[PDB]
Amino acid sequence: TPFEQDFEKDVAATQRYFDSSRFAGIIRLYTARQVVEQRGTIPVDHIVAREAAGAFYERLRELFAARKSITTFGPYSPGQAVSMKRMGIEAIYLGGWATSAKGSSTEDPGPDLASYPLSQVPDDAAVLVRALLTADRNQHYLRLQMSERQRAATPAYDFRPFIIADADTGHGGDPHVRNLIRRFVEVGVPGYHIEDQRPGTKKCGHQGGKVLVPSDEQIKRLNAARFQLDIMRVPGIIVARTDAEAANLIDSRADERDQPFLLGATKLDVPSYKSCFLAMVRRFYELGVKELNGHLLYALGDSEYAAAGGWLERQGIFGLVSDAVNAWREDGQQSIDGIFDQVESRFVAAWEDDAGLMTYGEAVADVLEAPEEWRAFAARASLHAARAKAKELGADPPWDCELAKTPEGYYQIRGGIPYAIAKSLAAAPFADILWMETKTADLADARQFAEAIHAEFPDQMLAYNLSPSFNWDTTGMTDEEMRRFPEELGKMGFVFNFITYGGHQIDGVAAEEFATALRQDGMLALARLQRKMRLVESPYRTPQTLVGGPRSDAALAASSGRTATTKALVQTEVPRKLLEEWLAMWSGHYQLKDKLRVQLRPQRAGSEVLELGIHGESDDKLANVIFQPIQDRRGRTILLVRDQNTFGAELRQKRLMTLIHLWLVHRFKAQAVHYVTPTDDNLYQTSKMKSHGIFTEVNQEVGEIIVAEVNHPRIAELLTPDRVALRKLITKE
Amino acid sequence: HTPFEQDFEKDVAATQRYFDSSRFAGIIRLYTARQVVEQRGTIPVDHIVAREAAGAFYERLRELFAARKSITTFGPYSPGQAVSMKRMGIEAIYLGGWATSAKGSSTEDPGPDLASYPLSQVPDDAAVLVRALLTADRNQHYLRLQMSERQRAATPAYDFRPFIIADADTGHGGDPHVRNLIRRFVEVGVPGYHIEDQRPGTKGKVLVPSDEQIKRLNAARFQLDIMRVPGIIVARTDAEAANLIDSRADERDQPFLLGAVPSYKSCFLAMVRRFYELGVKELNGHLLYALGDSEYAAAGGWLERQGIFGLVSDAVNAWREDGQQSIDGIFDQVESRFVAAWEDDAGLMTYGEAVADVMAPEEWRAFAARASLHAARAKAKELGADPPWDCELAKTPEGYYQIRGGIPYAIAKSLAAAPFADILWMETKTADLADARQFAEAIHAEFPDQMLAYNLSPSFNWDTTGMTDEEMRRFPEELGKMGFVFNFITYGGHQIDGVAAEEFATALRQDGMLALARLQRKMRLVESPYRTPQTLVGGPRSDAALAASSGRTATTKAMGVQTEVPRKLLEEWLAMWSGHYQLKDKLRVQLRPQRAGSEVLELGIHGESDDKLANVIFQPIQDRRGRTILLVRDQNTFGAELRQKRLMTLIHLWLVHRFKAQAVHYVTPTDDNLYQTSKMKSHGIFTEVNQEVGEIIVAEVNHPRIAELLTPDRVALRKLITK
Amino acid sequence: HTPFEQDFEKDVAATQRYFDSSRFAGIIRLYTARQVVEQRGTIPVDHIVAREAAGAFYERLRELFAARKSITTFGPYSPGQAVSMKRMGIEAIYLGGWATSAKGSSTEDPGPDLASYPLSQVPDDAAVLVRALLTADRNQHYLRLQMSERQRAATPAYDFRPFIIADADTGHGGDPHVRNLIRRFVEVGVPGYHIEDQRPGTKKQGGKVLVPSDEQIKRLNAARFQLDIMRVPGIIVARTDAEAANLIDSRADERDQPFLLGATKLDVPSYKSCFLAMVRRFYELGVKELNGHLLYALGDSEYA
Ligand SMILES: CC(=O)SCCNC(=O)CCNC(=O)[C@H](O)C(C)(C)COP(=O)(O)OP(=O)(O)OC[C@H]1O[C@@H](n2cnc3c(N)ncnc32)[C@H](O)[C@@H]1OP(=O)(O)O
């Protein structure tokens, strides 16, 4: 029947899609049929996400093969996202941290607990996608107005939405994951990252209490994600993150893959950690601190309280409680917060110490005093399997992991890179990119991970996070090592590397500076910003054009049939064009035939150190000057020159650099020029420039500094608009 | 009287007292206390955030108005920016439609400021700011409770009250739209709102009549009264730059109406039809109208006589010559010449100007300026003047009347609105104190107590004004003197957000992770809260919440380097110095940029009273190989009795160590500077010292001697201080 | 011709064909194919739900028009009601501002039909209906796949295509507002929209204010422009409220001028003057409540 044919057709199409190279080495826990059953009859098409996912994945694969990588950050505004793409960053990251910090109209801003509605990050992403798509429409409108030559001169930016957004833990089970993924796709996001934490379990300001889930639950999240993406015909990029490097807890011991990393007590005559904790709290309560009534949460038996009480007595913890409660009364019954913390820390240490906390592998290893054969077996063995092997070998050490459980019921695990590897390997067949969460930026830790993964999956693309809070200047790395760090990640197969909430940070610094500047220097604060924007030729210079006014006018013209009523320059800096005209004379006299362009930008971003460059038709830098203007206390300006070049030998001793100096002196109203660590050429140059009368006086501490005082009469003479004196200078008359 | 009637009378009385309070002195309501109470229903509501903010914010503005002072602010583009400006000590916040338009939302594409977003858009934006501020306050207060009383007197507490004036555009329609818009602002906690006298969706600037503007303001006040919020209503006029108005009905606008030949409309459509007929199919705007043959004929005749049809032929030929591309540019050329021709021939002027051409001259001008059309005609006919004047003839195709925009019209509008508004605001493009004065003086002549507001366009090129840097610095203070109490850089946040993103993206591609290192260094130097971002967003208070929620059962415990030479080092050296010369004064070291975001630093030594005893304004510079030089531009040991005791030598030792300096350059040194550096050479701090008297000192650092002095035993250092 | 120029010319040609298709027979556009393509940018988008619904829905209406037949429907107040009426075999759905006003939202108090809600309000309502219909279809189709061939022939399959004509009120302002409103409808899958010739925020029998025909036409043209950009052949319904209207906010348009009322006894003072004078008398006789005259600055001569 037509009905059956339509079905078989889509199943076949879906099957081809499944079997395409895109999903090589990917396992699905469902059939093409199971996907088509969900799709209904009325066509839908999430084209933005579909096309973005394709190009973005192909591009990452390309960079993986070349051992290169994208290095990006999280934009905190649509403007920031559009800006990054102009500056030529290929892809964008969007994180839950910044989403948490920003809040919304109904969500108070706060810490990254992923406590917002699951719609929060997609809602944020939607703004970025609309910003990018709009930027593209505005760019394309302007480019249509341009001539072919203008189009080859002005650059076209790539505003495709290559985004990998934060899906947190999935915000629940499979219905939550699918809903979350659906919301991302619908707004055009092609990439999503899911971590192996338990939801609503995150702590701030502690180096403890990070709770993982079993690997089977993580895998089902990834599989659920893939299912949803398949239904929607979007080849979305699934990033599987593990938090196992820094984790201490897991909410279940059911999965065999996690059981090697379970910690347990070896001294079994010790009472449970839970019992001992609650007994300690109950003692505080009984001694009269009514505040600490946490024990009322549980219904623990008298036998357990007794046993636990005995242990706390022996170890002198009950002693510390008495002392603490007495200190509490002495102070005069104030916040117990600080005093309780003191006792708890000492209690935890005492329990850990006495209980003999280790893995089952470590426990059986102690009884065997081959050693290294066992470690390898333990690391890949379930609990039931490891016990069987040990008993066969005549080892049967006392080991109980139930005894080490927290009050909530979370089991303790040995966090570290080995555990991160174990988890990531299990997840590799269900994910396109793997990511080990890290606090510390360290290439050795990254290598350990990357090598272990690639040993079993040579084609597995990776991702590396860079915490904005991590103090880089405590690593002891050189500036040059810091510069190369992103490239070193790329070499190890980490293709997508991100400064999570970079946008949040730069947004803050900028607001602080401008607010301070406005109170300090009034409207000069805005003047200085505007100057900065003109120098780098920022689009924000003309903000009406930036947001898309030209295209909007066009729309109004179309809407109104051109009936809508539309009827009713002072120089701020010495223009680059002036030097280009001088270089036209110079190029003429020496008969060079190369049209010379002048460029003046900061040598690096947001630097006071400028670089003037002379560029040929091939865009080769013929000459340059790296300098920085400095004012004295009265506002008198000095040009400080750190480097200069007329790179071509056959362009030297023709006063090319003298023309540049004349422009720089005029542009910056310079009274003097200081050359720091001059060369021989520099001594010869400045001495002759003194003879031509550009400088009145020239002092030279050979090898260290040249100080050249400007001859203002002679500058004025050369700058006369008739260019008589200037023509003589160029021709050497 | 029944309980029902008593409850009513009570609230009416309470509402009447509220009406009559000094807060609303000189304010006219077009409704009674009864009319407000009958809207309120039975079930209590309380918009406390907006209510309390409005009270404090209004009192504060009144305070600043009487002292001839003012708040100078900008529009934050993020909740972080809004919280930041309050830390930096800015008292109030502006929120504008421009930035809201530019940002967009999950369902709104970002774009130009046409106020084409849903009326909920700006309130939704404001809600984030209010929540950010309220949360900042809760986080601050939590931390301050943990502090001791001496820590609380040491650390400063910032004011995070939501003093916001948000953009209500044109009101987004009639009274139901205005009330809905105001309601949405109040519900999210905004205490101030600004409404302009434009026609919606016309952003060629079209005003509305003053009666419509007033009804918007009155509608706003009504809604605020219902909600028991003494909200700050800002009445803006766009009449300074306007050319059109969508009605001639209001008497207050009639003095500014321009009037005249065939109608401007007929002549325009005939011109367009000619382009169409000559073969430019693109220009078919004439199909919008059903203009009669008689009108087309008349209009055609006029265009022929004046040679406009001539210009069309020429234009269409140029269009074909180029090769039939966009007519946009060519049509504009012709339209401009056409407009000029029509204006010229029609004799386009106000009715006052028309009768003036035909009682003294100056007596008439004064009468015309305050007279309706019917009134001005009556007076003229009585005086035996009856000039030909038709304003219908000058109407645009849409039907908008033409008006004489300018500061005089802005004044006329603002004066009519003054009894219904708390703050008046003349929209301006150009920053100009003379234009501001003209406005301020005219308003204050009739309303001495009327508070004003001044907008500062981010796009306005300040360096084209010809003002000095010092004049630019004083501009905000000069506004404050003329009674402009609230002055704002509309979308400042948008601009600074952009520059920051450009720089960091460029920095990241240029210097990799050093781009982040440098940002972090900057944050440490100014001691920014963003240094510890976990604390900033409110982690400490969140942990407390988790402890309460869990009864301290939730597991938080586990089982199984100096980045810069610290200021403290110098403080310890100054403790030795203070000791030897027996000063009782504990000396504090401060090193911040001399002005915001500058490479030029200022090290300052501060006493217990926070008086600056000494300072050094310097800036580190690298050569091409990375070698560092300290460039000193100024230096002071301000107290004469603290001089020649090697105070400045200790500071230099620290600066040289902190910045790994190989040399020190002093630019435009004084005599004291020559004496100082010469003696510092004798103590061995410098190896060589060259001095071009009055111009520059170059001092090369003696690394052996620096290392010696920095030895942790401080033997050499002790000798230096005491000798 | 460069690849850039070729891609442009291609889309303009495609757009021109679309313009000239029979679908838009007798329809005037005040803009060119070029002016539409200029707006579209580079990155593909596709509003397929609205596009396909618009096609089928328009063809079906044309069919019924030629047969002198019609769809008789109502406005569903819930997604359940919308799905239900399709089961009962009603072909198309209406969605009105009245019900949207009466229902309110999480931030909008329910109230009279003044179209004072944000312009996003009715599209937000429509989005629920479209999702309800699309979901009903997916649920139906899932069950029908489980059924045998015989069962399929037995049990009827309902048509849950989103044939909706939704209320765009007056356009909620000028062309930017209309285009934004239309865009929001299309994005959620609505293929039909109705725009009336009233002045916004003017609704109250009597006191019904119309706008000139040139302004109404520009709304419709602005709507068409937006639909063309988005490649959706959307059904534009032009409503007139002129049957019961008494007022118009301008006399500029020639088409309305035949219907203008005027005074023939010219020795009578203006209606405005007489109204304000009446109110001022109440005020002067001591009713302080009636101070509406303070809104205007009417001269002494006019008051006299
Ligand atoms: C700035 C610093 O602190 S680092 C030192 C700068 N950079 C370098 O040393 C890199 C190598 N050097 C160079 O590239 C070039 O020689 C530069 C940049 C120093 C000078 O560039 P040029 O284009 O040659 O300078 P320009 O032509 O303006 O020279 C000005 C005068 O000095 C003369 N001059 C320049 N270099 C020399 C030389 N090596 N020997 C003799 N005379 C010289 C020129 O002939 C000219 O005088 P003239 O026209 O009367 O003969």
Ligand SMILES: CC(=O)SCCNC(=O)CCNC(=O)[C@H](O)C(C)(C)COP(=O)(O)OP(=O)(O)OC[C@H]1O[C@@H](n2cnc3c(N)ncnc32)[C@H](O)[C@@H]1OP(=O)(O)O
């Ligand atoms: C920095 C520029 O670009 S120009 C700005 C210069 N600033 C001023 O002129 C402001 C007023 N002057 C001053 O405050 C001083 O010049 C300052 C800034 C040097 C501060 O002075 P001090 O804190 O006394 O500097 P300090 O004591 O470290 O001087 C180092 C040596 O020079 C000596 N010295 C300082 N001033 C004098 C002087 N006027 N005459 C002789 N010797 C002097 C000191 O005694 C010391 O040597 P000694 O103790 O072995 O004899």
